[PDB]
Structures are given as C-alpha cells and as structure tokens.
C-alpha cells in the first residue's frame, strides 16, 4: 500500500524482503537496487546459508525478480541519485547498503525522487533514530530520514528501558559477543579496523560498539550512563548482549526476571521475551523479537549490580523491526 | 631432578610435557599414563592442530615414547591404583586426566606409590588450591594433593589481586568468552550440561564457571564479592575474561592500566602482562603469561565501575603455570 | 502399525524419529533407549543445531517423552538384552547406536524379545544389507537382522547402478568429501584412527571408507570394480561423493546427465535427483533423496572416463531411507 | 642484489616477503605498494592468523616499514603506472595484487619503469608461465612478464610430470579440495561466481579450476589430457589435490609411491615430497615444497587407473616458489 524500494540487497536487504514477504498486510516492495544483478538477486534470495532456501517461487522476469506471484523491478546503480524513485514514485527507501548513513549520503535517495529514507543502521549525526518498543511513538511524519539504530541497540534498549523504569539504572557497561558480519575479513586483509582486519572465523575480534551511547538516543534518561565493547566471534548469525548495570533499588535475579516477564507480556509483547530454556545461539535463529532475556543467567551481585544476558538474531530480528518501523512510517501518512 | 609422572596425556598433559621440555632446568618427567597407547602418545605429541608440529625428535621405544634424546616410560591403565608410581618411585603426579579431582580419586595415585599429586584443575573441596603469582607462597611441602585452579581462575586472579590492592574491589561480575574444549560436543549429543551438549563450533554456549568463586580461594579478601558465567565460542584455544568490578577509590582507565603495568613489571613479571596492541585471539597463542591485559579496552564508568578485558591461552599459559607450580613443589622438599 | 523401538537416540536416532514423525502413515515408534535420560531425550529432540527447533509439542511424561500428541516410552540401558522389547512386544528395533553392528551384538535385541533389528549402518559381515532403490526387493521377511548400509553407500549406489546399466562400469575410484561426525574428535584426542583423532573443525581428515566395496553388496556386478577414500571436512552435515569411473560405452557429460535425469524421473524418483542449480552444501540440507547429482559438474574425459559429483545429507537423507527400509520391513509381513 | 618491488601486500604479498626474509642470499625487496598504509602494512606483516606472529622487529619508519634491520619503502597507488619503479630503479615487480594478470594490466608496471613483472598467479593468455621443478629451465631473460601459475598448478604439475614420465598418462581428472581464499565471501554476498558468493566457512563450494588445463602449459605432453574441478572448504590454508589418471603401464600403488620417492630425492628434491605419516591439513602448514604426496592414500584400481592425493600449503608453499622463480629471474641476467 506504501511504495517501498530496497537499496542494497545484502544481508538485511534480503532478510527484510523475506521478513515482510510473510508479514500479513504491509507496504509494497516494488523495486530493488542490487549492485549485483537480476540473476544474483533471485539466486541469493532463494538460497541462504543462514536463512535456508526461500520457501517461495523465486524466478527471473528478464530484468527483475519475481516471488511466488509478484514481480519486483530490479535496478543497479551505486549512485543513489540516478535511481528511478521519482519516476516510479517511491515513497520509502529501505537504505540497507550501509554506505549512505549520513544525512548527505542518504539524501541522495530523496533527490532521486524518493520521499522518505529508512536507514537500516545507525544514522550519522543529524538523524532521528527510533527503536520500536522504546521511542517509536516520537516519530513524526515530517521526518525525511530515519535510523532504525543498530542490531545491538535494538536488543539492548528494550530490557534496559525496563531495567531503568523498575530499578533505576545509575550506570553500567555492556559487552556484546556478536557474530561476524560482512564488515569483517574472511582472511587477514585490509580494514580500517586492524582488529576487524583479522580472519573472522579464526579469532575473537574486539571492536568498538556504539550501541551503548546509542541507547541514550532512544532512552534519554541513560545519557552518559553506559558504554561497552563488542567481541566478534566465529558464528554467522545470532548474537548476545552482556549487560552489567548498577541500579538504584536493591534487587535479586528472580525479581529482575519477573520484571522482564511483565513487560514481555505487556508493553513489549513482541519486542522483549524471556527464555527459561537452556538454549544456545542456533536455537534463537529466526526469532521475531528484538531481544530474548536468558532468565537462567540473570545475576544480581551486591544487591545493586545486575547482570543480564539477552539473545538476538542480528539479521532476522532486526529486519523484523525494520519492517515494523516501515509499517509505522506507513501508518503516519507517507 | 624431581621424578614426575603425567597421568592423562590430553591437551594439558601434552602441553605440559612440551611446556617444560623447553623450560631450562626443571624436574624429570619419567612416565606417562596415556589410556591411548605408545603410538597414539608420540603421534599426538609430535602433531598438534593448535600447538603445531613438535620441533623435536619424537619417536617410539617399543613401549614408551622418546623425545629429542630422552625415553619416557609409557603406561596405560585407567585405574590410578594399578600404576607403578611406587615401584618407579614417582614423586609428583601431574593429574591432568580431569576425572580424579577430588581428594578420594586423586588419592589413588598416592596409594599406587606416588608422593604428591598436582591436579591440573580445580580440586574438589578438601584440596589446597594455589595460583602462581597470587598465593603460591602459602604452599606447604606437607600438602599431599594440590590444585592449580582452572585456566580462567589463573587469568583472572592476578589482575584481580592488583585491582583489589590498589583500588579496593567492593564486588563485581566477570564473563569469560572461552574457546571450546574436550568437554563440549562436536555435534548435538549427550552431556550432563544440556548447553555443552550442543555442537561446539556452531553455537555460543552459555555455561557455569567456578573461576569467580575460585578467586576467593587464592584471594580471601574477595570471598563472596564475585561471580560470573562462561560463554564457549567457536575457537580452539585462547580465551578472554571480561571483568566488571565496582571499586573503592575513584579511577580512570589510564590509571588502572598503569597499575597493571607496575605489577606486570614487578611482582607479576611473567604472570601478568599489558598489551597496547590491537591484537585478536590468535595473536595470544603460545604466550607464557597467565594473563595479558588488553589496555586499549580498559573502561571506567561512573568513577568506580571498572571493566577489564584480559586474554589467556587456556592450554599453553595454564600448562606453563602447572610447570611452574610443579617446580615450586620441587623447591619445597619433595 | 508396526511396533518400532529406537535403540540409540543420537544423530540418526533423533533424525529418524523426526523423519517419520512427518512421514504420512508408517509403523509405530513406541520406545526409545537413550543412555541419556528422558530430559536429555526431549531437549535434544526439540533443539537441533543442524535440524533446527523441532516444530512439535515435545514434552516430558514423567518418564518418557511426548510429541505433539503421543507418548513414547523412554528407557535407558546400554545392555540391549536387558531391554523390554519382549515385554512391550517390539517388532522392529532401529539399531542406531553404532556399537551393535555385528550379528552377535545386534542379536542382543532379538534375545531381549525384539523380532527384527535394522542396523542404521553397515552390518558386520554375516548381515543382509539393502539400499532402497537398488536392491531392497531382495529383502526377505525371514531376515532377522538388516543393514541399511552407510550414508555414503546410499548416495553412491543409485547413480552408480544407473551408470553401470547404461554405460558399463569397468572400474573406478570414488572420493567422498564428508562432513565431520560424532566419530571424530573436537580437539586432538584418542581415537583408533590417528587421523580422526585430530580436531574435526580444524583439518581436512583423510579416512578410510567402506562405501566403495559396499556398493558391490547392493550391486553384485561392481564387485571388485571400485574403491576410494573419504576426506572429512569442517561442516556439520551434507556431504559430497566424487566418483570417477571408466565405462564401456563412449559418452559425454550431457548424455550422462540425461541418463540420470531419466532414472531420476522413473525407477529412482525419490532416491536419485539431478540439480542444475549452482548450489553449495547448505542448500542440500534436509533433502529427502539419497543422492542429488550436480549436473553442472559432470565431466567425461577421454570418451570413457566419467566424473560424477553427487550431494547427500548424511543425516536426514539417510534417516529418510532408514524410515523407508523400515516401512518395507513393515510391508513384507511382520 | 636484484631490486624487487612487491605490488599487492596481501596473503601472497606478505607470505612472499616472509618467505625470503628467511631465504639465505636472494634479491632485494626495496618497496611495497600496499593500497592500505604503512601502519596496516607492518601490523598485518607482524601478525598473521595463519602464519603466526612474525619473528622479527617489524616497525614503522614514518613512511615505510622496517624489519629486523631493514627499511622498505612503502607506497600506495592502485594505478601501477603512477608507481616509482622507474625512479627507484625497480628490476622485478612481484605482481601479487591479483588484478593485473593480463599482458596489458601487468604491463603498467613496466611503463612505470619496472623491468620485469612476475605475476603471482596464472597469466592471462599471452604470458609465459613457468612452474619451478617442471619447466623453469625454459625461462628466457627476454621474458618481460612471467606467471608462476596457480597454487594448485604448482602442487599438481610435479607429481604429474613424474607420473607421465614413468607410466604414461593417457588422460585423467583431478579434484582439488581447497581452503577458502580472499576471493570468497564471508557471508552470502555478490560474487561473479554464484557459488563463491556463498558463505565460505559454512559450505563446501564447488568452483572452476584452471590448474587442469594449466598443467599442459608447463607439461606440453598433457595437452588436452586433463581436467577437473575445485571444492572450496572451511579451512584457512593448506589444500589437497585428488588426481585420478589412467596410465599406459600397468602398476600398483607401492610402485607409484616409490617412483615419487625416487624423484622426490632427485630432480624434485625440494619441490615434491612423500609423506608416509597419517597427517592432516594443519600438519602441512608452513611446508616449503610445492607438493607432498600422501603415500598412505595412493591407489591403483584396474592396473591402470592411479589415484594420487597430494597436499599443498597454497600460501607458503606457493610463496616459496615465487621466491624461487624470482631468484631464477635474478640468476639469468638482470
Ligand atoms: O551495519 C549494517 C549496515 O549498515 C547495513 C548493511 O549490512 P549487511 O549486514 O546487510 O551487509 P552486506 O551484506 O554487505 O550488505 C551491504 C550491501 O550494500 C550493497 N551496496 C553497496 N553499495 C551499494 C550501492 N552504492 N548501491 C547499491 N547497492 C550497494 C552491497 O552490494 P555488494 O556486495 O555488490 O558490494 C551489499 O550487498 O545494515 C546494517 N545491519 C543492521 C542490522 C543487522 C545487520 C546484520 N547483518 O546482522 C546489519
Ligand atoms: O578442566 C580440565 C580437566 O581437569 C583437565 C583435562 O583437560 P584437557 O583439556 O586436557 O582434556 P582432554 O584433552 O580430554 O584430556 C583428558 C585426558 O584424560 C585422559 N584419561 C581419562 N581417564 C583416564 C584415565 N583414567 N587414565 C588415564 N588417562 C585418562 C583422557 O584419555 P582419553 O581421551 O583416552 O579418554 C584424555 O586424554 O585439565 C583441565 N584444564 C585446565 C586448564 C586448561 C585446560 C584447556 N584445555 O584449556 C584444561
Ligand atoms: N551421522 C550420520 O551422518 C550417519 C550415521 N550413521 C551410523 O549410525 C550409527 C550412529 O551414528 P550417529 O547417530 O551418527 O552417532 P551418535 O554418537 O550421535 O549416536 C550413537 C548413539 O548410540 C548411543 N548409545 C551408545 N551405546 C548405547 C547403548 N549401549 N545403549 C543405548 N544407547 C547407546 C550413544 O549414546 P551416548 O552418546 O550416551 O554414548 C549415542 O547417543 C553409526 O552406526 C553411524 O555410522 C549412518 C548414517 C549417517
Ligand atoms: N592465497 C593463496 O592461497 C594464493 C593466491 N594466489 C594469487 O595471488 C593473487 C592475490 O591473491 P591473495 O594474496 O591470495 O589475495 P588478497 O586479496 O589477500 O591480495 C590481493 C591484494 O591486492 C591488493 N591490491 C588490489 N589492487 C591493488 C592495486 N591496484 N594496487 C595496490 N594493491 C592492490 C589488495 O589490496 P586491498 O585489500 O586494499 O583491496 C590486496 O591486498 C591472486 O592472483 C591469487 O589467485 C596465488 C597462489 C596462492
């Protein structure tokens, strides 16, 4: 119902497409800018080493893909401005290329005729960034460019918000043991980040995370109260956040968990979740929630220091939110 | 000079042997109880997917291995009591089989004629446990059974001790992102631990760690001040400890680091170390220190909450300490 | 309709259970001998790092598992003879423990009261071994113990049979690049096979394969015409067979492929398959056929030397056949 | 003694540098064109997830690296022509960038002032390609551009040559189970090769190999007698070639092996080798020979069909040859 165009048909680009494919009554993905090609587009959409073979009749239309029924125009141009958004009448552009995350760069879409742009990552500075289930209500239809934050910020914010509300977060540090991603090197090669420059499947790669300071955007009350690092490890998808926060009200794990289970059943039903099962990474693959609290691990040391371990499917979960946020955009005029 | 016998020729058993091989003027490894066989013993000692091919003339003596020069008797019997310790006159038994870690079980060696037993892990209860560079001086030659703690406890204790001395640890939680180990399953199989039961190279496996409470043994002042969890990840060796502790004296990362660098150059020269290099796992393989602080990551949030990230080669580093502790045993009579 | 009992609830044991769960109108799995426990049984059946979370209401019945509806008695005893087969009235025992593959060992089930025993592997000598789609018709209901061959023999036989029929296999060698399996070591440890003794996820492990000589059992005409090796590589499931055979009638790849496609649509519809898609391992996960020919790779060098590359999901595909063979057992009398 | 410049400081670029570092009395590497930077250059040269930390005092000279002693000018420009070869007086350019493999592209170095260019791969058509230990003697100092073939062609040629000489290769097919390389994707992304486009550490990736037809270049007698495919698997370095060839003279494995051992000790001492040890991948890391025959696996089926399995360290072994070939260039005139 809302004309959507996907710029960047990579991990999230393709996940997004598959995430709503199934969604019940969304917007309308009508175009795809895959630097690759029509061939590459349908092949990589039908086959996924992580998502599995796409259960859908994904074919080629001579010059655009076609899923069980629909034809999606496929275009290729790495210069956003030369894109048909205007001519086709694109309303929303899911900017998942990871190169146009600043007002300027993302603005290229706008000038190609696109109406809004939804950056599938952290916006660069002057950009409104929302996390569904935390601050999505502050969204204005007058927002020309949006940021759906990072995968880590989406997993972290929700239970943080709950933690702050019910116990009063004084300050804390989080560490994310995160799967490797396209940004890393398969084998020791050139990367701005000399740590990321190292073979991804062979090492545990320390690296900076913004998610900590990013939580403050979606939850102003935590401004300057958090910070952390990321540890990239030998797994394709599904990551885990390890949050240690010193709170205001004395507490115990069981109590913290219960708090998560209210919110999980209430204001975050669909965003936050609480698992009491002895699961591991894989078990969380293809989960639609932004964050799943691993109850069995919650620890409160010293009546004020709370440790929380939450899981997240950085690809699918996040793509689900991108779909969600887009839906909102749709519900708020254009 | 001190007759040593290795019970359990596995990862640490073989690492230990190779660790002192090179040591300059030790004790004397004269026997090896490898449930396997003479063949298996020299082959797995010469070839190591993690340590690399052993740079030494490792052969077979018909019924015992032989390294560049020496002949080590090889025996096989999973019932410690039926071992020749007595007859051969074994003084110290490096108990690295991981099954005899309680006073009773480890005691089997004693009754086979062995004098002392050095458990290559956490002792089970009634066992003196020492960490070189922390409490090794409390060692008594009247100690019939010793525990060299866990790999994680050895990496953690040293910088914790420093942290406590210089800033006063009030309480904290540590999380160890640790390589997989023989205890885990290659593919989903039976394990007491349903999380460890899952494929090791495919998931991030949450699991209980004792190291937290264990620090209290070697550093009494931290009794009941710590606790944490372990996260097993897809890497063969080299792990990392993520310690978050709330201290007494306000501080800043640079200051914490400096503190580590005094100790590193003083009382812990050889145990603790501080790296300012943007390294990753692999880079720490084959390091002789128990713990290397990753300076670039030290974070102090809220003037009292300190986050420390230290690396450790769970196989080699620990084996080095086992060699060290054995040497001590040697220096204290028998 | 046919009382089935699963001895050994491991990779195939669990796959088998899940393979028929879905089958349309089979036999009846009423018991499971899982050395583990009821807990371990349902947990490892519900969660699978390779198969994915089981889409079924898998619970615990106090002392037996329960799937979306059904209750399956769970028993534990590693001594087949002490099993209730008799008392419960077990007709068929899916021997997937991998330890009772000889007439004697497998015979234990019989003497516990079980009627037939279907070894989920290669039988040890004096055992009828059948491969569905090749020699299953030679099955006699008077067969007290069956062997469903290896996973590799099931992938190889079908297209070999076709190759022999249409071109006349003179002699050849096959090489299977196979995923690692429970039989291998996670890290350098003791194994009868010093190559398998090496870390599975770190090396390419050459190992002996019987599949070559095994084809001769199910296809007598190939007796002494084949032989090969196996190369275990860093992947959980899905393997590939590389068969090079010198034939009688001169040919060309496209012709060989057509031959496979002919049979694929006829006598082997459901056993053999031919993919023209540029797929890779993962893409073949959860395929019900015993063998999928990778058309794009077929090569005929010298008008008589034919190279074939076929894929197989060693866990699922094979389990599907085990279900199939059991069904047969069910159709020919009791 | 011969002014050498390295264009492309990647896997081979860095391996080459380290390969001769140790060589005894070579040529003289005086410059490095690393699109990266001086920083990146020394860091990635000192640290290697595969090669290990470089045992050498590798520092920064403000604007060029410096190894234990020496200063190597470091330059960055992806347009070969704008390189100082002329001004510095570069004699040989080790073209290891993998983008200038055709006469035209590689010719850019020449026109920047470089004398010869040694492509670290397969040359594109009109280029003399030599394999040390096979056809290096046909080298002319009037050769303006050289190709040191592929890593696979270097492993294959030597034992093929021997096979041809002693038994008469009629025709055959080879399959190489090769480690992943920079050319593959860490995660499903865009690649010309839709198979290589798939996650490297997750799948077994079939891919086309030239090595088969390439052998014909260095061994004219095999023109049109060979062909094969490659199967990229989840390992960083060290690959294996599986050659099946039908010969002229009837033979047996032990005889074939002896033939290899004969040459291994003679004309190929240093190029070919024969291992009787039950080793696996890792064990062959850092081997200086182009090819190591795995004796234990040699198979002769049908008195004429010979199967050979040889190992090769695609990074180090090949780099050793590149050093070797360069040395030759150095010995035949300028
Ligand atoms: O943080 C990331 C980032 O902001 C973004 C993309 O991440 P992804 O994980 O999908 O990575 P990728 O697989 O490399 O996808 C990037 C694609 O962009 C295409 N591309 C680059 N430049 C263009 C231009 N100019 N025009 C069209 N397409 C373009 C690339 O194509 P090529 O491969 O041909 O270079 C890639 O296809 O999403 C963020 N992210 C957020 C949450 C979760 C998450 C994850 N992977 O877990 C990533
Ligand atoms: O926490 C561990 C544990 O306490 C111990 C051993 O750990 P390791 O990592 O070496 O494991 P492994 O490779 O499985 O070695 C165990 C060997 O014991 C042999 N064995 C078992 N039972 C016997 C008996 N009864 N008699 C003789 N030998 C025996 C096993 O042989 P098999 O494989 O034939 O079963 C194994 O060979 O060390 C601790 N540890 C501490 C620090 C660091 C560390 C690491 N790996 O990082 C482990
Ligand atoms: N994996 C695959 O790809 C295929 C395997 N096979 C064959 O199937 C067999 C098993 O292989 P797989 O499932 O892969 O391996 P697993 O080790 O995963 O399964 C073997 C099971 O046997 C169980 N077990 C052992 N002894 C007993 C006993 N005495 N009583 C009850 N349970 C017992 C083991 O329990 P525990 O773990 O408690 O020791 C384990 O669960 C082998 O014959 C194998 O060659 C055939 C085709 C495919
Ligand atoms: N790896 C192996 O096993 C073997 C590889 N080879 C061959 O060697 C070549 C390179 O392979 P490999 O080292 O493996 O791969 P890498 O990608 O690791 O190396 C290629 C290098 O070329 C650099 N580069 C690209 N363009 C330029 C340029 N125009 N100017 C300066 N530097 C440039 C790249 O820099 P950047 O990363 O900044 O883009 C990269 O560092 C290929 O021909 C390959 O087939 C041969 C034998 C073995």
Half-sphere exposure of C78 (CA within 13 A, CB side): 4
CB contact set of C96 (below 8 Å; sequence gap of 6+): C6, C7, C8, C9, C10, C12, C13, C16, C120, C121, C322
For residues B314 and B8, is the Cβ–Cβ distance under 8 A? no
Q: How many CA atoms lie within 13 A of B36 on its CB side?
A: 27
In this structure, which residue's CA is closest to atom 24 in ligand 2?
A: B78
Task: Identify the H or E element spanning B330.
Answer: helix B316-331
Q: In whole angstroms, what separates CA D181 from the centre of its chain? A: 13
Which DSSP symbol is given to D195? T
User: Which of C90, C325, C115, C304 shows the shortest CA–CA distance to C218?
Assistant: C325
Ligand 4: centre distance to CA D319 (Å): 12
CA of A184 to the centre of ligand 2 (A): 35
Strands A299-301 and A305-312: antiparallel
Pairing of strands B305-312, B299-301: antiparallel
Neighbours of D291 (CB within 10 A): 28
Distance CA D109, CA D104 (A): 10
Q: Are C235 and C281 in contact (CB under 8 A)?
A: yes
Q: How far apart are CA D111 and CA B122, in angstroms?
A: 67
Let me know whether D126 and D157 are in one domain: no
Helix-, strand-, coil-residue percentages of chain A, each rounded to 5: 30, 25, 45
Q: How many CA atoms lie within 13 A of B266 on its CB side?
A: 11
> How was this structure obtained?
X-ray
Do A66 and A38 contact (CB within 8 A), yes or no? no
| Beta strands, E only, C127-263 | 145-147, 169-179, 205-208, 226-233, 239-247
Contact map slice: B 6-25 vs C, CB within 8 A:
10-11, 14
Pairing relation of β-strands B291-294 and C28-33?
Answer: unpaired
Atom of ligand 2 nearest to the CA of B179: 47
Q: Token pair for residue C187?
A: 């890290």
Task: Say which DSSP state A138 is in.
Answer: G
E strands, C153-225, where?
A: 169-179, 205-208
**Taking CB atoms and an 8 Å limit, are D282 and C229 in contact across chains?**
no
Among B177, B244, B296, whose Cβ lies nearest the Cβ of A231? B177
**Surface-to-core class of residue D270, CB atoms within 10 Å of its CB (0-12 exposed, 13-18 middle, 19+ buried):** middle
DSSP state of A288: -
Let me know: does C303 contact C251? Beta carbons within 8 Å. Answer: yes
CA–centroid distance, C140 to ligand 3, in Å, is 26
Q: Are residues D74 and D126 in the same domain?
A: yes
How far is it, in rounded angstroms, from Cα D295 to Cα D303? 17
Q: Nearest-CA neighbor of B101 among B146, B134, B143, B151? A: B146
Alpha-carbon distance B178 to D109, whole Å? 48
Residues of chain A contacting B178 with CB distance shorter than 8 Å: none
Cα–Cα distance between D324 and D334 in angstroms, integer? Answer: 15
* DSSP notation for A295-308: GGG-EEETTTEEEE
Nearest alpha-carbon partner for A50 in A232, A235, A319, A324: A235
How do C59-60 and C64-66 pair as beta strands?
antiparallel
User: Quick count: other Cβ atoms within 10 Å of Cβ C107?
Assistant: 17
C-alpha angle with apex B301: B300 to B307, nearest 5 degrees?
50
Check CB contact under 8 Å for B283 and D47.
yes
State the angle between helix axes of A11-22 and A316-331 in degrees (0 to 180), rounded to the nearest 10.
60
Cross-chain residue pair C285–A43, CB shorter than 8 Å: no
Q: How far apart are CA A253 and CA A167, in angstroms?
A: 12
Ligand 4 pocket member D35 (CB < 6 A)? yes
Q: Residue B55 class from Cβ within 10 Å (0-12 exposed, 13-18 middle, 19+ buried)?
A: exposed
CA distances from B253 to B244, B303, B308 (A): 12, 10, 9
Nearest Cα neighbor of D45 from D73, D7, D17, D26 is D17
Place of tokens 């290669």: C122
Shared domain for C166 and C263, answered yes or no, is yes
- Does D282 contact chain A (CB < 8 Å)? no
Contact B329, B86 (CB under 8 A): no
Q: Any bridge partners for residue D293, and if so which?
A: D274, D310
Query: Is the CB of C189 inside 8 Å of chain D's CB atoms?
Result: no
Spell out which residues of chain D touch residue B40, defining contact as CB-CB under 8 Å: none
Residue A99 in contact with ligand 4 by CB distance below 6 A: no
Question: Under a CB-based contact definition with an 8 Å cutoff, are residues C149 and C218 in contact?
Answer: yes
Identify whether the C-beta of residue D285 lies closer than 8 Å to the C-beta of residue D50: yes
Nearest Cα neighbor of D143 from D325, D329, D319 is D329
Give the strand pairing for B239-247 and B272-275: unpaired
User: In terms of DSSP H, where are the helices of chain A?
Assistant: 11-22, 38-46, 103-111, 151-167, 211-218, 253-265, 316-331
CA distance C260 to B85: 65
Residues in chain A: 334
D319 and D293 within one domain: no
Chain D: residue whose CA lies nearest to C239: D204
Contact A13, A20 (CB under 8 A): no
Q: Which of C186, C205, C239 to mutate to test the interface with B (most CBs of B within 10 A)?
A: C186
Tell me the C-alpha distance between A142 and A292, whole Å. Answer: 33
Question: Which structure tokens are listed for A71?
Answer: 């034809």
* Nearest partner of C312 among C120, C200, C175, C154, judged by Cα: C154
CB-ligand 3 contact for B186 (6 Å cutoff): no
Resolution in A: 3.0
What is the Cα Rg of chain C in Å?
Answer: 20
Q: What token pair was written down for A284?
A: 């969380």
The answer to whether residues A157 and A247 belong to one domain is yes
Nearest by Cα to C73 from C322, C82, B191, C84: C84
Q: Does B125 lie at the interface with D, CB-CB under 8 angstroms?
A: no
- From chain C, the residues in CB contact with B190 under 8 A are 34-36, 40, 44
Exposure string of B160-180, with b = 16+ CB inside 10 Å and e = fewer, is bbbbbebbebbbbbbbbbbbb
User: What subunits make at least 3 CB pairs under 8 angstroms with D?
Assistant: A, B, C
Q: Are residues C237 and C291 in the same domain?
A: yes
The tokens describing C245, both together, are 């055979």
Structure tokens at A18: 């598959």
Instruction: Phi first, then psi: give them for residue B149, nearest 5 degrees.
Output: 60, -165
Edge-to-edge strand list for the sheet holding B3-7: B59-60, B64-66, B71-75, B28-33, B3-7, B92-95, B116-119, B145-147
Neighbours of B224 (CB within 10 A): 10
CATH number of domain containing B202: 3.30.360.10
Residues D187 and D288 in one domain: yes
| Ligand 2 pocket member B318 (CB < 6 A) | yes
Backbone angles phi and psi of B162, in degrees to 5:
-60, -45
Helix or strand run (H / E) with residue C311: strand C305-312
Task: Give the strands of the sheet with C28-33, arranged side by side.
Answer: C59-60, C64-66, C71-75, C28-33, C3-7, C92-95, C116-119, C145-147
Cα distance between residue A207 and residue A194, in whole Å: 9
Residue D40 Cα to chain centre, angstroms: 24
Would you state the torsion angle of the CA atoms of residues B41, B42, B46, B48, taken in this order, to the nearest 10 degrees? -10
Helices and strands: H and E segment counts in chain A:
7, 16
Query: Is the domain of A99 the same as that of A34?
Result: yes
Rounded to an integer, what distance in angstroms lies between the CA atom of residue B170 and that of residue B157?
15
Residue A331 burial class via C-beta count within 10 angstroms: exposed 0-12, middle 13-18, buried 19 and up: exposed
Asked if D207 is an interface residue toward chain C (Cβ–Cβ < 8 A), one would say no
Rounded CA-CA distance C51/B19 in Å is 41
Pairing of strands A305-312, B3-7: unpaired
Could you give the CA distance from residue B25 to residue B2 in angstroms, rounded to a whole number? 11
- Contact map slice: B 68-107 vs C, CB within 8 A: none
The candidate with the shortest Cα–Cα distance to C44, out of C17, C19, C70, C25, is C17
Query: Contact at 8 Å (CB) between B322 and B19?
Result: yes
SS (H, E, C) B151-166: HHHHHHHHHHHHHHHH
Cβ-contact A120, A142 below 8 angstroms: no
For residue A111, what is the domain's CATH number?
3.40.50.720
Does C302 contact chain D (CB < 8 Å)? yes
Task: Say how far apart CA A290 and CA A314 lie, in whole Å.
Answer: 8
Answer whether B236's CB lies under 8 Å from B180's CB. yes
Residues B135 and B178 in one domain: no
Quote the CA–CA distance of C15 and C181 in Å, as a whole number: 14
**Cβ pair C132, C155 in contact under 8 A:** no
Residue labelled with tokens 């560490």:
A175
> CA D250, D252, D255, D259: dihedral to nearest 10 degrees?
60
| C182 in contact with ligand 3, CB cutoff 6 A | yes
Q: How many domains does chain C have?
A: 2
- Same domain? For A8 and A144 the reply is yes
Query: In C, which residues are within 8 Å of B197 by CB distance?
Result: 40, 43-44
Could you tell me what percentage of chain C is helix, strand and coil, using 3-state DSSP and rounding each to the nearest 5? Answer: 30, 25, 40
Detail the residues of D annotated as belonging to a binding site for NADP(+): 11-12, 34, 78, 314
- Cβ–ligand 3 distance for C147 under 6 Å, the answer no
The answer to whether A57 touches A51, Cβ cutoff 8 Å, is: no
C45 membership: H or E segment, kind and range = helix C38-46
Q: Can you tell me the distance from the alpha carbon of B116 to that of B334, in angstroms, rounded to the nearest whole number?
A: 8
Q: Chain B partners of C201 at a C-beta cutoff of 8 Å?
A: 186, 200-201, 234, 236
CA–centroid distance for B264 within its chain = 19
Q: How far apart are CA A161 and CA A144, in angstroms?
A: 27
Q: Is C86 in the pocket of ligand 3 (CB under 6 A)?
A: no
Q: Does A52 touch chain C (CB under 8 A)?
A: yes
Q: Alpha-carbon distance D331 to D136, whole Å? A: 12
Contacts 24+ apart (CB under 8 A), A271-279: A271/A132, A271/A133, A271/A158, A272/A133, A272/A158, A272/A159, A272/A162, A275/A311, A278/B194, A278/B195, A278/B206, A278/C43, A279/A311, A279/B195, A279/C47
CA C200 remoteness from chain centre: 21
Mapping DSSP to helix (H, G, I), strand (E, B) and coil, where does residue D268 land? coil
Residue tagged 């930077």 (tokens): D37
- Report how far Cα D273 is from the mean position of its chain's Cα atoms: 16
- Token reading at D314: 């695609």
Same-domain pairing of C251 and C103: no
- CA within 13 Å, CB half, A127: 26
Unique residue bearing structure tokens 């998808």:
A237
D8, D40, D186, D200: residue to mutate for ligand 4 pocket, most atoms within 8 A of CB: D8
User: In whole angstroms, what is the distance from residue D176 CA to residue B250 CA?
Assistant: 60
If asked whether residues D278 and D145 sit together in one domain, one would say: no
Spatial CB neighbours of C234, under 8 Å, sequence gap ≥ 6: B201, C180, C200, C201, C202, C203, C204, D201, D233, D234, D235
The boundaries of the domain holding residue D239 are: 150-314
* Residue in chain A lying closest to C52 (CA): A283
Judge: D194–A40 Cβ closer than 8 Å, yes or no. Answer: yes
Search chain A and give the residue with CA nearest C280: A49
* Closest CA relative to residue B163, chosen from B98, B82, B248: B248
Long-range pairs, C53-56, Cβ under 8 A, ≥24: C53/A283, C54/C18, C56/C21
């Amino acid at each position: 119902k809302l004309k959507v165009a996907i710029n960047g048909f990579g991990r999230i680009g393709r996940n997004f497409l598959r995430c709503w494919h199934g969604k019940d009554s969304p917007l309308d993905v009508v175009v795809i800018n895959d630097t690759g090609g029509v061939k590459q587009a349908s092949h990589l959409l039908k086959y996924d080493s992580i998502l599995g073979t796409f259960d859908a009749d994904v074919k080629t239309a001579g010059d655009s893909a076609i899923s069980v029924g629909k034809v999606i125009k496929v275009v290729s141009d790495r210069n956003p401005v030369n894109l048909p958004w205007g001519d086709m009448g694109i309303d929303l552009v899911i900017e998942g290329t990871g190169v146009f995350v600043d007002r300027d760069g993302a603005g290229k879409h706008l000038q190609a005729g696109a109406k809004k742009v939804l950056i599938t990552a952290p916006g660069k500075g002057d950009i409104p960034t929302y996390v569904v289930g935390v601050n999505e209500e502050g969204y204005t239809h007058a927002d020309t460019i949006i940021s759906n934050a990072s995968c880590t910020t989406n997993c972290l914010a929700p239970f943080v918000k709950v933690l702050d509300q019910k116990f009063g977060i004084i300050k804390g540090t989080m560490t994310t043991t995160h799967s490797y991603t396209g940004d890393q090197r398969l084998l020791d090669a050139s990367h701005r980040d000399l740590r990321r420059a190292r073979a991804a499947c062979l090492n545990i790669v320390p690296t900076s995370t913004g998610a900590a300071k990013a939580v403050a955007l979606v939850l102003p009350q935590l401004k300057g109260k958090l910070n952390g690092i990321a540890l990239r490890v030998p797994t394709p998808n599904v990551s885990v956040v390890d949050l240690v926060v010193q709170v205001s009200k004395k507490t115990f794990a069981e109590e913290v968990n219960a708090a998560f289970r209210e919110s999980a059943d209430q204001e975050l039903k669909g965003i936050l979740s609480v698992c009491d099962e002895p699961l591991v990474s894989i078990d969380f693959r293809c989960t639609d929630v932004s964050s799943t609290i691993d109850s069995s691990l919650t620890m409160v040391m010293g009546d004020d220091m709370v440790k929380v371990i939450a899981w997240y499917d950085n690809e699918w979960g996040y793509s689900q939110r991108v779909v969600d946020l887009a839906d909102i955009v749709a519900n708020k005029w254009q």
